[PDB]
Amino acid sequence: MEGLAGYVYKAASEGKVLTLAALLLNRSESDIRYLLGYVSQQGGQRSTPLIIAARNGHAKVVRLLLEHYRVQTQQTGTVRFDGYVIDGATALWCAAGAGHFEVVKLLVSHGANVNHTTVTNSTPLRAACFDGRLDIVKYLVENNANISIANKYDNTCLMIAAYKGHTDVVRYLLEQRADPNAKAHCGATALHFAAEAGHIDIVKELIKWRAAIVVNGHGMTPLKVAAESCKADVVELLLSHADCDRRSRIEALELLGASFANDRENYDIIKTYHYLYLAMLERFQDGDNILEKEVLPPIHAYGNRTECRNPQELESIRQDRDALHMEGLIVRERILGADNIDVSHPIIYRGAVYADNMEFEQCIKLWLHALHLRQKGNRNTHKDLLRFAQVFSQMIHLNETVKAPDIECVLRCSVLEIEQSMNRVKNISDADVHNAMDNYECNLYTFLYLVCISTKTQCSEEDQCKINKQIYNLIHLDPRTREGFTLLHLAVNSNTPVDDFHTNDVCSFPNALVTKLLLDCGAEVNAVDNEGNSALHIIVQYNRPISDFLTLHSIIISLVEAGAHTDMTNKQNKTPLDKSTTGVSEILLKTQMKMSLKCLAARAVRANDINYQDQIPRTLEEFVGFH
Amino acid sequence: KFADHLHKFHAAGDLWQ
């Protein structure tokens, strides 16, 4: 019984009973407890018998485990429902999350931790509400399962019940003295989640229970949240309160009539003009008290359209689906603000549609505006630069010449984003270093793709000077990946993952043009990575020096003429021609290197050690370390 | 399609279980 947990875990995985009954055979206290309580690792979970006995919905295994002996119901464990590996998940928690009433009835009957917290303070009742079953929720509440207990971010079980689409448990929770007006760390009142998801009935019984209306942390009223996600059904209910005033009525109407046009799922031009007309008509027919919208400067991204503030002007837009999208973008930015989280996505989607229609000229404009909005919000723009690289590669691939100001702007935003990513990496603990460093490497790769696109685009002298300055700034910032590769080591490495969407079409690392641009921008031609491989140790290890020779000769003749040391030594004591995977790449190196008695004497000093701290010039003290 | 790649942006632990 030393480690025979495989039998019990496999039997409980499918809920086998006779296998467990044969497993238990006339045990006294010591070995019976050592069997029943024997947890194991099974990486990713905690592998207790009574975690998979409840996750798979098998009350018989828990029944034999809890009938004549009381196994540890309060067993700390981690269980996964997709990417939801949450610690502290006892049998009650995982059972409620999966949604099995039988095993829950076989846990609380003996007395279980109905309010068992976790790292996220997710009560078992919250997991049941996420599942949505009414039977488990009322069973927990009737056993005093701490309805008021929230998560870390104050996300009480009512809010997750009102977001995942479970009207029954919402009605029951409101019927059992819950908190309709419960807030959150950022502000997520119970109307916000239901309005965002768009459930009509949940908002119906919330406003029937006087859930009240309070503004979100992002300056969002529940009606504005409802209108933001294009849910026109819930807005009509919230507009019936007759306490929002016409300032919010004509705000929400414009907001959703703008959201419908520039949205992915429920994109409807017919359901856009109707709501925009219903919006403006409220303020353009009242008498001598008509309301005119606040002025908005003509944004260059949206075709220099100053929006429409007339019934005749709006009527002129119900003939041009190309103009209603821009008008929706303008109205959404005017109402949602320039700092909201979700104001960026419609702009990116409209630019993506323009790109899919091969109209990249307006796609670049819209996405540049979206990138500026995202970067002036301290947001994570580690994918927008990738989408720019994909658009630029698709433009270069077909026949199209990208504008040089576009590459200048995207490169400037890229160096700003990479500096920001370095700041986040340096200013964070190991809780999220993995994802932050992955985003940092992604940002570096996107900058490299943008540089490769810039090399393959002819532009005037001023444009090239601007692009070279933008590259030079990041070169002097000295960025390095997790394995020590600088911004030049990746431009010569063939193992750098080029994105497969469209940058795979035209971006081929290693590049001669990219490495020449980097070396002409002040790149450390003689730097080393974490192991010690310099910019020359990496290119020499090339797969194809018989077909891609032109960018292997023009990346060795350019490295060694920029000051790269052909006799350098990495950690494993290997010169670049000692680290040659081919012959055509060491012949070129042996042609592009010269015998210097400085290198020979440095090798002699490094071999027969001399204690070269003093009695040597300061600059040669690193030269000896090179070899 | 570029618009198809936008469906992946529709991560926060607030609304998790």
* Annotated binding-site residue? A218: yes
A580 and A617 assigned to the same domain: no
**CATH number of the domain enclosing A491:** 1.25.40.20
CB A486, CB A479: distance < 8 Å: yes
CB B17, CB A166: distance < 8 Å: no
Q: Which residues contact A244 (CB under 8 A, 6 or more apart)?
A: A213, A221, A223, A238, A252
Tell me the CA distances in angstroms from A466 to A148, A401, A408, A454, A518, one per residue in order.
Answer: 58, 18, 7, 11, 14
Query: What is the full DSSP assignment across A62-98?
Result: HHHHSSSS---SS----B-SSS--BSS--HHHHHHHH
Q: Is residue A305 part of a domain?
A: no
CB A464, CB A403: distance < 8 Å: no
Query: From CA A229, how far away is CA A203, in angstroms rounded?
Result: 15
Q: Please count the CA atoms within 13 angstroms of the CA of A49 that sit on its side-chain side.
A: 30
A612 and A537 assigned to the same domain: no
A15 and A93 assigned to the same domain: yes
A451 and A588 assigned to the same domain: yes
Q: How far is A128 from chain B (nearest CA, A)?
A: 9
Main-chain phi, psi angles of A235, to 5 degrees: -65, -45
Residue with tokens 């829950």: A104
Task: Residue A453: count other Cβ atoms within 10 Å of its Cβ.
Answer: 25
Per-residue burial over A466-493, b if 16 or more Cβ lie within 10 Å, else e, is bbbebbbbbbeeebbbeeebbbbbbbbb
A621 and A557 assigned to the same domain: no
A340: region left, alpha or beta (phi > 0 left; psi from -120 to 50 alpha): beta
Chain B residues whose CB is inside 8 A of the A97 CB are: 17
Give the count of Cβ contacts less than 8 A between chain A and B.
56
Query: From CA A18, how far away is CA A65, in angstroms rounded?
Result: 13
Beta partners for A528? A534
CB A348, CB A385: distance < 8 Å: no
Tell me the CA distances in angstroms from A614 to A515, A619, A620, A626, one per residue in order.
Answer: 37, 11, 10, 17
Main-chain phi, psi angles of A7, to 5 degrees: -60, -50
Query: From CA A414, how far away is CA A422, in angstroms rounded?
Result: 12
Q: Is residue A210 part of a domain?
A: no
Q: Is residue A292 part of a domain?
A: no
Helix-then-strand count for chain B, H and E: 0, 0
Chain A residues whose CB is inside 8 A of the B10 CB are: 264, 345
Structure-token pair, residue A288: 């001598």
Q: Could you tell me the residue range of the domain that residue A441 belongs to?
A: 391-595
Residue with tokens 């032109």: A550
Structure-token pair, residue A242: 């007759």
Query: From CA A42, how far away is CA A6, in angstroms rounded?
Result: 10
Query: From CA A576, how far away is CA A538, in angstroms rounded?
Result: 8
A620 and A478 assigned to the same domain: no
Q: Is residue A333 part of a domain?
A: no
A440 and A537 assigned to the same domain: yes
Distance of alpha carbon A193 from its chain centroid, rounded? 21
CB A231, CB A195: distance < 8 Å: yes
Q: Which residues contact A26 (CB under 8 A, 6 or more apart)?
A: none
Chosen for mutation from A87, A259, A349, A391 (greatest number of chain B CBs closer than 10 Å) is A349
Residue with tokens 């433009």: A395
Final residue of a structural domain among A104, A132, A149: A149
Final residue of a structural domain among A114, A134, A149: A149
CB A490, CB A496: distance < 8 Å: yes
Determine, for residues A349 and B6 on separate chains, whether the beta-carbon distance falls below 8 Å. yes
Task: Residue A188: count other Cβ atoms within 10 Å of its Cβ.
Answer: 23
Task: Residue A523: count other Cβ atoms within 10 Å of its Cβ.
Answer: 24
Q: Is residue A203 part of a domain?
A: no
Q: Is residue A39 part of a domain?
A: yes
Determine, for residues B15 and A97 on separate chains, whether the beta-carbon distance falls below 8 Å. no
Beta partners for A86? A79
Query: From CA A78, how far away is CA A111, in angstroms rounded?
Result: 21
Q: Is residue A127 part of a domain?
A: yes
Final residue of a structural domain among A149, A166, A198: A149
Under DSSP, the state recorded for A342 is: T
* Annotated binding-site residue? A599: no
User: In chain B, whose CA is at the least distance from the CA of A126?
Assistant: B17
Main-chain phi, psi angles of A273, to 5 degrees: -65, -35
Query: From CA A529, how far away is CA A531, in angstroms rounded?
Result: 6
A507 and A608 assigned to the same domain: no
A617 and A522 assigned to the same domain: no
Q: Please count the CA atoms within 13 angstroms of the CA of A200 that sit on its side-chain side.
A: 6
Q: Which residues contact B15 (CB under 8 A, 6 or more apart)?
A: A155, A160, A163, A193
A627 and A523 assigned to the same domain: no
Main-chain phi, psi angles of A79, to 5 degrees: -130, 155
Q: Is residue A145 part of a domain?
A: yes
Looking at the 3D structure of chain A, how many domains does it have?
3
CB A424, CB A452: distance < 8 Å: no
Task: Find the chain A residues whose C-beta atoms sit closer than 8 A to any C-beta of B.
Answer: 81, 84, 86, 97, 120, 122, 126-127, 130, 151-153, 155, 160, 163, 184-186, 188, 193, 264, 345, 348-349, 351-353, 355-356, 363, 383, 387, 390-391, 501
Q: How far is B5 from chain A (nearest CA, A)?
A: 9
* Annotated binding-site residue? A241: no
Nearest partner of A345 among A366, A323, A316, judged by Cα: A366
Query: From CA A193, how far away is CA A165, in angstroms rounded?
Result: 10
A78 and A115 assigned to the same domain: yes
A467 and A565 assigned to the same domain: yes
Strand, helix or coil for residue A534: strand
Task: Residue A389: count other Cβ atoms within 10 Å of its Cβ.
Answer: 27
N-term to C-term CA, chain B: 33
